[model samples]
Target chain A: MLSGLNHLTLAVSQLAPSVAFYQQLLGMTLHARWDSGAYLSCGDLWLCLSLDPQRRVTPPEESDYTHYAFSISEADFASFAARLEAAGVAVWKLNRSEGASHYFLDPDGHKLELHVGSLAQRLAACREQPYKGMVFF
Target chain B: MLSGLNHLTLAVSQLAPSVAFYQQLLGMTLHARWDSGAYLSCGDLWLCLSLDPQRRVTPPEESDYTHYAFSISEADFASFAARLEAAGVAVWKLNRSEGASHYFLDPDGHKLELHVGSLAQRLAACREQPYKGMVFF
Candidate 1:
C-alpha cells in the first residue's frame, strides 16, 4: 500500500535546539518551522522534529540500539566524522566486514547513524560478523 | 554529504508482532531478521524495527504528535484504507487543505501515516491551513 517514505517525525524535547543541531551539525536544511517544531530536509528525505516537553528524553543505551541511519558515500566518511566530532558531537564507531558505520545522538538523544553501504551490504556484514556487538540484528 | 534516507529504525517492544504488522498490514517486504530486530523494505526506503523491552509504548497522545508518514498514490488510497480496516487496524483521518492523510499505529505504538501526497504538498497545505492541529511544522 505504501510507495515510499514521506517523512520521519521525532518527538524532540525542544524546538530550537533540535532544529539547530540538525541544521548546523548534520547539514540539514530547514524547510519550515512553527512554535513547537521544525521540518528539516536531508536531500529528499524530510525529517520532522516536533516538540513535546512532557515526553522523556531518551538517552543512548548499549542494549537499545534503535537509530535512523543515513546514506553517505565512502569518500566523505572520514571528513564527515571529523566535522561532527569537531562540532562536539559524541561519535561512536562500528566496523563491519562490508562497510563501517558511525553512531551519534541528536539533541533529543535520538540515535542517528551515517552508514556507507546499502541494505544488502549491511546485511552481508552482519552475517560475517554475527558477534561484533553492532546494532544490525 | 548525504545520499538520502536509508532507513528509519523504531524501538519496537515486540519483534514478531511488529514484523507481522509491517509485512502483513502495510505490504512491506521483510529482508532480514535477528533476535532483537528485523529490516523491512518499502520501495527504496528501509524501515527497521528493533526490540526495546523497556522503552515506553506510548498510546495515541495528541500533544505528542510525532508520526512518520509514508507516500501513497491517490489511485490506491481508498482500497488501501479498506484493506487496513479489514485487517482490524484502527485508522484515523486528518484532513488538510492540500491532501488527505490516514493515521494509524503499529503493534508497538509507533504512529504511522499513509499520506496521499508528497512532503511539498503537505507543507503547502500546512501553510494554507495554519492551525489544523496536524504535524506540518
Candidate 2:
C-alpha cells in the first residue's frame, strides 16, 4: 500500500496566505508545490492543501470543535497560542486528559491541533524525501 | 512522544448503521464501544466514529474533496467500490492527474478516498513511528 494517508488534504482560498499561516504558526516546512496545490510538513505530518473555493459548504458548528490532532510541545504551544491571540483568532482555552494540548484553524477553517511532544517525535523520525505525491501512475 | 496518529475522530449520523456498514464491508475489528463512539481497525488505520445526525459540516467553497484517505490496494479498492455500489451509495470516479481513485462518503457525508498510490514524497525526511497505530495507544 502507499502508506495510508501519508497526506491529509484541505482546500484554501488564497494559497500564499494559508501557506503563511501554517508556515509561521506551526513552523511547517514548505516541501512541495504544484500548479494547484502545496505540501507543508511539521514532524511526520503532511498537510496537503489545494486551492479550490467555489463549493459553498457549511461551517463547522461549535459542537464540531476539533477534527484532526497533531503533536506539539508546551513551549511551542504557548508560543503558538500567543501568536493566535496576537492575531485575535479567539482560540478556546481547551485541555484534555489525553495528557496533552490544543487547536488552530487554517484560513479556510479546517481545524488543526498541536499536542505535546509531537515536535520532538517529528524531529526524531526525520525523513527528507522529495514529495512523492504520485501525480502519475 | 506517542508517535503517529493513535486514532482519528469522524462524525457520523447513524451510529448503528455506519457501524454495521463498516464491520461488514471492511471487516474492521471493533476495538471498543462506548455510549456515543466506536473504534475500529482493518490494518494500521483507525476508524473512530461519533454519532451525530446533523453534525456533518461542509468545508467552504473551493476546498479539497476528500478529507481523509486511507491506503489500500487496487484489489481492496474494487471490493470497497462494489460494496458501496451494491448498497446504493452513489460514488465518484476520479483520474485527477495525481492518480486514478474513487470517492465515497461515510454515513455522515465525511468524504473519504480509497486511493491506489501517489509518488509525491513530502514526508521524505519526516519522522514517525511507522505503525504505532497497530495497537490502541
Candidate 3:
C-alpha cells in the first residue's frame, strides 16, 4: 500500500524570502522542489509551499486563510531571529517579549508560526489575553 | 525539540456526514470533536475538520478553501467505500472503468483525499495540466 499523505501544499506569494525563512529557521531540507513551489520535510511530514500572486492581495476573511500551529522545542529563538536577519527576512510579529511565535510569511503570503509548548503555558497564565491573535504585528 | 507541523484546521460546510465519512473511511481514531469540528489523526498528524458557515458554495472553488489530503492504503479502498456506503457517506470518486479519484469531503464540508502515488506520477506525467488549483477527486 502507498504510504499516507506525503505532502500538504501551502500557497505562498514569493519564493526567495519564504524559502529562506522556512529552510533556514526551520532547518527544512530542500527535499524535492521545483519552480515557485518547494516541498519541505521537517521530519516525516512534507510541506509543499507554492507561490501564488492572488494570495498577496486577498484579506484573511475572503481568502480562507486560517492560522495553524506547530509545536517546537524551547531552543533559544535568537538563532531563528539571526537566521532571518542573515537571510534579510523581516520578522513581522512584534511579540518578541513573549518569545513565542516568530511570525513570517512564505513566498505565497501565507502566514506561518514557530511555537513552543511553554507558549501554551503563557497563554494559560495570561488568562486575559490568552491568545496572541488579539493584535497584529 | 518539537518535531514537525503537529496540526492543521481545515474548513468544511456539513458536519455529521464529514465526520462519518472520515472516521469510517480512514480508520483514523476520533476523539471529542466539537459540534462542527472533529480531529482525525493520520499517524501523528492531527487534522481538524471544522464547519464554517461561510465556506465556498461552488464545488470548484474548493481551491479557495484550505486543502489537506489524508493518505490511505491503496488496497483498502473497497473496505473504505463499504464503510462510507454503510454510514450513508457516499463515495464521491472511486476508480472504475473511467478516470477517477478517491476524494471525499468531511462532516463539516472540508475536502479530503486518499490520493494515490500513481496519481502523483500521473500528475507528473501530465505536465501540461500541471497539478495546480484543483483538488484531486
Candidate 4:
C-alpha cells in the first residue's frame, strides 16, 4: 500500500527560524510556502516545517533515540558538520555499529542527523551490538 | 551535502503496538527490532517507532496542522482506504485542492495521511486554494 514517503511534516514552534535552518543552512530550497509553513526539497524527499506554537519544544534524553537521519557522503560529512556548527547549531554524535553520525537539533528542537552510512551498514552493525530496534529494509 | 531522508524515528509511548500497527496494518516489513523501538520500511522510506514513556500523545488541533503523508497511486488508494477502515482505524478526510486525502492517527496520536497526489499537482492546486500550511512538496 506504500510506495515511498511523500512528505514528513514537523510541528515547528516557529516557521521563520526553521526556514533559515533548513533552507539557508542545510541548503534545501523552498519548494513552496504559506502562512503557516514551507515545503523544503531535499532531492527526492520533501520536508514540511509547519508552524504550531502550541507544540512541544524540548529535547529528549539520548535514550529516547528519536530523530531523522539523512545520508551524506563521507567526503562531505566534515564540511557539513563544520557548516552546521559554524551556524551555532549544537552538534552531537551517535556512534553506531556500522558508521558514526552527527546529531543536532533544528531551531524547533527537532533532532536530526547527517550520517555517513547507509541502511545496510547500520543493519549489519546492529546485528551484533544487538541494539534492539527496527532498521531499514 | 545530503541527498535525501534516510530514516525517521518517532518517540511513541509504547513499542509493541506501534510495531504491530506498522508491520501488520500498514504492511511495512519488520526490517529490524530492538528493545526500545522497531524500524519498518515503507518502500524506500524507513520509519522508526521507538518507546518514549514521557513523550506527548495529544491529537493536534486544526490550527496545529502538522502531519506526514505517504504517497499511494490513485489505483491503490481505495483498496488501502478500505483496508484501513476494515481494521477499525478512524479515517478523517482532508480535501486538498488537487487531490483529496485520508488522515488518521496512530495508536500514539501522531497524525499521518495517505494521499493520491503528486507534488506538482499539489503545487498547482495550492496556487488557487492556498492552504495555510505545507502540502506534499
Query: How do the candidates rank by lDDT, highest first?
Result: 4, 1, 2, 3
Deviation (Å) of B46 in candidate 3: 1.3
Write candidate 2's Cα lDDT for B11-128 as tens digits: 7766777778667654666655555666666565555667765575453222245466667776677776676688876444332434546676665556666666543431332223
Which candidate do you rate higher for DockQ, 1 or 2? 1
Which structure among the candidates has the greatest lDDT?
4
Scored against the native two-chain complex, candidate 3 gets a DockQ of 0.21
| Candidate that scores best on DockQ | 4
Extract clashing residue pairs from model 4.
A132-B34, A132-B35, A133-B33, A133-B34, A134-B32, A134-B39
**DockQ result, candidate 1:** 0.45
State the lDDT at B7 in candidate 2: 45
Question: Whole-model Cα lDDT per candidate?
Answer: 0.74, 0.56, 0.54, 0.75
Report the lDDT of model 4 for residue A132.
Answer: 38
B1-137 per-residue lDDT for model 4 (tens digits): 68999788788987888888888898887877777877678888878777888766664454245567888988999899888988888654332333667788788766788888776777777777787654444
TM-score of each: 0.83, 0.68, 0.60, 0.85
Per-residue lDDT tens digits of candidate 3, residues A1-137? 22355556666666666677677656776654455566566766666666654345344445342445566666755576566567655444556565466665444445556666542354344465433322211
**Which pairs clash in the backbone of model 1?**
none
lDDT of 3 by residue, B13-125 (tens): 77676666556655666653555566565666665666777766444233432345655556866676566567664334321111224555555444455554443454454
What is the descending DockQ order?
4, 1, 3, 2
TM-score of chain B of 3: 0.53
Q: What is the TM-score of chain A alone in each candidate?
A: 0.81, 0.66, 0.57, 0.83
TM-score of 2: 0.68
- Regions of candidate 1 where Cα sits further than 4 Å from its true position: A62-64, A91-99, A127-137, B91-98, B126-137
Per-residue alpha-carbon lDDT of model 1 for B83-132, expressed as tens digits? Answer: 88898876544555356678887776667887776668757767877643
